[PDB]
Every structure is written in C-alpha cells, then in structure tokens.
Amino acid sequence: PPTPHLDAIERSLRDTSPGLEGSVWQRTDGNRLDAPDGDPAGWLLQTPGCWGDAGCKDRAGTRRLLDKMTRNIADARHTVDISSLAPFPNGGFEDAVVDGLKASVAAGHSPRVRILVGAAPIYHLNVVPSRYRDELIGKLGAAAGKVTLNVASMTTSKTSLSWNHSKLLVVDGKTAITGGINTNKDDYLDTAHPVSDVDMALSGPAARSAGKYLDTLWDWTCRNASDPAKVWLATSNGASCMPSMEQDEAGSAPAEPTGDVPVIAVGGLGVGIKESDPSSGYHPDLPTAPDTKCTVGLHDNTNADRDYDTVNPEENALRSLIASARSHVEISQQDLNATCPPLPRYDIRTYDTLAGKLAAGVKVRIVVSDPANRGAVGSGGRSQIKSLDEISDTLRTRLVALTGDNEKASRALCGNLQLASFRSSDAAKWADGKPYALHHKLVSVDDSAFYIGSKNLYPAWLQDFGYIVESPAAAQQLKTELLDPEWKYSQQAAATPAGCP
Numbered sequence: 001p002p003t004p005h006l007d008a009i010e011r012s013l014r015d016t017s018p019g020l021e022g023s024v025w026q027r028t029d030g031n032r033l034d035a036p037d038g039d040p041a042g043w044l045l046q047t048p049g050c051w052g053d054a055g056c057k058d059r060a061g062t063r064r065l066l067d068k069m070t071r072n073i074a075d076a077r078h079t080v081d082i083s084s085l086a087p088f089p090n091g092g093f094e095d096a097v098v099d100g101l102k103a104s105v106a107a108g109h110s111p112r113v114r115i116l117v118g119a120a121p122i123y124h125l126n127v128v129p130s131r132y133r134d135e136l137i138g139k140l141g142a143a144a145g146k147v148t149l150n151v152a153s154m155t156t157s158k159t160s161l162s163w164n165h166s167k168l169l170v171v172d173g174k175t176a177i178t179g180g181i182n183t184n185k186d187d188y189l190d191t192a193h194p195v196s197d198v199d200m201a202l203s204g205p206a207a208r209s210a211g212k213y214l215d216t217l218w219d220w221t222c223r224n225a226s227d228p229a230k231v232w233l234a235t236s237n238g239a240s241c242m243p244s245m246e247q248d249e250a251g252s253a254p255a256e257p258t259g260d261v262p263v264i265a266v267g268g269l270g271v272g273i274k275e276s277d278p279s280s281g282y283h284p285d286l287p288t289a290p291d292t293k294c295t296v297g298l299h300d301n302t303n304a305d306r307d308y309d310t311v312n313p314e315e316n317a318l319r320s321l322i323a324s325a326r327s328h329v330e331i332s333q334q335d336l337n338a339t340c341p342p343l344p345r346y347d348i349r350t351y352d353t354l355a356g357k358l359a360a361g362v363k364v365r366i367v368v369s370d371p372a373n374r375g376a377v378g379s380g381g382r383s384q385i386k387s388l389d390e391i392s393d394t395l396r397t398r399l400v401a402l403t404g405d406n407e408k409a410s411r412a413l414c415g416n417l418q419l420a421s422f423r424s425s426d427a428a429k430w431a432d433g434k435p436y437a438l439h440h441k442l443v444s445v446d447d448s449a450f451y452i453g454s455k456n457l458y459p460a461w462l463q464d465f466g467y468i469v470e471s472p473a474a475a476q477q478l479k480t481e482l483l484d485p486e487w488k489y490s491q492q493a494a495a496t497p498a499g500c501p
C-alpha cells in the first residue's frame with residue numbers, strides 16, 4: 001500500500017533532523033486507529049461534539065474523550081505518561097487520571113506516572129508540582145503507595161518564549177491520545193460556550209514513538225531541576241526522577257504491530273533544550289521576505305534560524321504535508337497568523353507553499369477561529385487577527401511575489417481559496433450569545449494524509465508533538481465526521497477576498 005505523502009514528509013525530516021529520528025520524530029508501520037467496536041470512526045475524538053446543534057445540550061464528545069482517557073489509564077500495566085500546557089489536569093481530566101490509576105492498582109499493578117506541564121513566564125501557577133502531587137495522593141487513597149509519581153512544571157526559554165505545549169497521554173508505550181485539547185477545566189467542561197477541538201487515539205508502535213518523545217522532554221526536565229527558575233519537580237514515595245521511563249518500558253524488542261496504519265510521529269524541542277542537530281546537513285534557502293506592518297523584535301526562529309528547524313522537525317513536517325497535496329488541502333486551525341510582536345506574524349515558507357498550491361490549481365481551504373474571539377495570551381479559541389483579510393491579503397502578496405502579476409494572483413486566489421471562520425451549526429454564535437471558538441491543529445491533504453496534534457501553524461516556539469497518518473480509509477472518516485460538517489456550517493461565515501467576484 002503506497003504512501004506517497006508520508007514519503008515526501010519522511011524525506012523532509014531526514015534531511016532536517018536525521019539525528020532526531022527515533023526520539024523527536026519516527027515513522028512506523030502497523031498502528032491501529034483505536035476505535036471502540038461498533039464505532040469505526042470513534043478513534044477521532046472531537047469536542048464538544050454537537051454538530052448542527054447551536055444549544056449543545058449533550059456534550060457527548062467531551063464524555064467520550066474522558067471515558068477514553070479513563071479506560072486507557074485503567075488498562076495500564078506499567079507506565080502512564082501525560083503532558084499538557086499548564087495547569088496540571090483538573091476537573092474531569094484529573095478524575096480520569098485518578099479513576100484510571102485506582103483501577104490499574106486494583107488490577108495488581110504498580111504504575112509509574114509522569115505528568116509534565118509547560119508554563120509561560122508571565123503565567124502564575126496556582127497549583128504547583130508538590131501541591132498537585134499531594135492532591136493526587138489524597139484522591140488516590142490507599143492506592144498512592146503503589147503509584148510512582150513524577151510531577152513537573154517547566155520553562156525552557158524565558159527570552160524566546162518556549163515551554164511545553166504538547167498534549168499527550170501515552171500508556172504502557174502502546175496506546176496514545178494526542179491532539180489540541182487542554183486537560184484543563186473551563187475550556188471544555190463548564191461553560192455554555194465550549195471551545196471546539198479534536199484529538200485522536202491510536203495504538204501500536206507510534207505510541208512508543210510518542211513515549212520516546214516524552215523521554216526526550218524528561219531527560220531535559222530531570223537534568224534542569226538543578227535550576228528551579230526553569231523546572232519545578234515533585235516525586236512521590238522518595239522516587240527518583242525518571243528521565244527514561246518509556247525506554248525502560250520498551251526494552252530490547254521492537255514495538256508489536258496492532259493494525260496496518262502507517263504513521264509519522266513528529267514533535268519539536270522548542271528553544272533551550274537542544275541548540276541544533278549536530279548530525280544534520282540541512283542548509284536551506286531561508287526566505288528574504290518582509291512583512292507589511294510587523295517586524296518581530298525577537299530573533300525570528302520561525303523564518304530565520306536554520307538551527308531551530310533541525311531541532312523542530314514538526315515545522316518542516318507540516319510544510320511538506322501541505323507541499324505534498326496534489327488535489328486539495330484543508331487547514332482547520334485556531335489561527336494561521338500570530339500576535340506580532342512578540343512573535344512573527346506568519347510562517348513565510350508555509351504561506352509560500354499555500355500560494356504555490358493556489359497557483360497550481362490545488363484547492364486550499366482555511367477555517368480559523370472567528371476574529372470576534374478576543375482572549376488573553378493563552379485563552380484557547382482566541383483569534384490573533386482582526387479580519388480574515390489578513391490571511392487572504394498575505395496569500396495575495398506571496399502570490400504576486402511568485403506569479404509576477406496581480407491578475408494571475410487573482411485567478412489563483414479567487415479560483416482556489418476557500419477562507420472562512422469556524423461555525424459548528426446554522427447559528428452565527430452560540431445560543432449563549434458568545435461566538436464559536438476553534439482550537440484545531442489539523443491539516444488534511446487529498447483525503448489521504450492528515451496531521452492531528454498540538455502544533456499550531458501560527459508561529460510558536462514551544463515544544464509540540466503530533467501524528468501524521470496516511471490512510472485513504474481514515475481520511476474518509478475524517479472527512480465525513482469533521483471536515484465536511486465544518487465546511488457545511490463555516491461557509492456561512494466565508495470570506496470573499498479583495499479583488500474577487
């Protein structure tokens with residue numbers, strides 16, 4: 001079974017980060033999209049899960065995701081590995097962890113558990129590692145004595161604004177849930193205006209790849225607990241820091257296959273974990289582009305740092321995913337552009353790839369969060385543009401820079417671009433009155449290969465992770481369950497750019 005899209009991505013990653021293969025990125029065969037029997041598309045865990053229901057009575061997607069998290073942890077024989085943006089998991093998310101651990105201990109196991117969050121410098125952490133550990137111990141009750149906890153909050157770079165943004169739940173190195181959902185009450189659990197998000201569940205060797213990736217983050221975290229400005233660490237039962245928990249669990253034999261799905265795991269190390277991939281020959285033609293009305297003051301790691309690429313293969317992974325599309329690409333995001341300053345407004349190479357596809361007649365669709373979404377720096381569902389023209393107009397100038405003339409750029413822009421903000425029903429806003437917020441980090445290409453993960457397409461220099469799947473059957477489930485319903489309702493919020501019929 002051919003995988004032309006995974007092949008193009010694999011070439012990009014091996015030229016970018018050959019040294020990081022097997023830790024920060026890895027291609028595997030034999031994975032299974034982990035759907036419960038009777039629900040073939042249940043591996044796709046969308047939230048809140050109320051397509052075409054403006055009042056969203058039944059938050060059935062959020063209940064399936066928590067149910068799935070609880071069940072995967074309950075099955076744990078050996079290791080539980082959790083990462084997210086701060087805060088530590090609370091609400092139903094903590095209940096899922098606590099309930100799962102009690103069940104695993106009750107089945108006679110003594111699981112080791114890593115819970116890592118990334119914290120921004122300006123962010124104040126109400127519940128710190130030691131307090132969170134203590135809450136866990138208390139709710140676990142008698143079971144705590146059999147549970148080895150490592151809990152840690154971390155920040156890799158104050159100046160380059162870098163900390164963990166990956167959203168992972170890996171159990172025994174063989175099941176993995178990942179995506180864009182924060183294990184964080186307020187965003188998804190207790191509001192009549194809940195953010196729209198998506199996760200996926202798999203099993204197989206690509207779960208071990210996620211495990212390896214978290215070992216990389218914990219090697220750094222354990223070592224840099226020597227600097228409490230960077231790492232806060234708490235363990236239970238006198239346990240040591242466990243930097244290589246996933247490698248110890250893997251052992252010598254290679255991961256066993258669970259199905260037939262080929263997957264590329266790929267993350268990135270942000271800034272301040274590893275300066276560069278010492279074995280990488282990557283030497284790119286970095287784009288000479290200016291920006292209309294923003295210049296980043298910080299050093300532009302997205303658009304002008306070779307070394308950053310070599311330790312962040314996810315950014316080239318996403319670009320070569322779009323580059324790989326022969327027919328059509330769907331981009332469903334919270335944002336394509338970033339707030340500038342502090343970060344660059346956009347990823348030049350990404351917009352050049354998109355423009356190149358518009359000029360080749362490849363259909364491009366961009367659905368982002370509504371610009372009416374104002375939030376704080378990390379609100380989730382917030383928008384970082386004031387208008388959708390800040391995407392189309394950028395696509396235009398990058399088209400003119402390529403095609404030569406503006407007329408040719410209009411036949412490309414108006415002919416091949418669909419640009420909208422997110423809706424999940426016929427209502428323009430929630431029946432709550434507040435607007436729809438989108439939190440996807442999703443790219444789909446030719447209904448064959450897709451990315452689901454935590455890594456946004458807008459510039460951020462955080463540590464992220466995600467999976468690229470190539471499977472015509474799985475992209476078809478993705479199209480039916482998410483992409484078609486998304487466009488069915490977000491086209492009522494479509495943009496028609498400047499200079500177009």
Ligand SMILES: CCCC(=O)OC[C@H](COP(=O)(O)O)OC(=O)CCC
Binds near residue numbers: 459460462
């Ligand atoms: C600031 C540059 C990194 C960034 O942009 O951070 C976005 C992230 C949320 O990202 P997202 O989930 O909305 O895509 O917020 C945070 O990590 C900071 C919260 C205090």
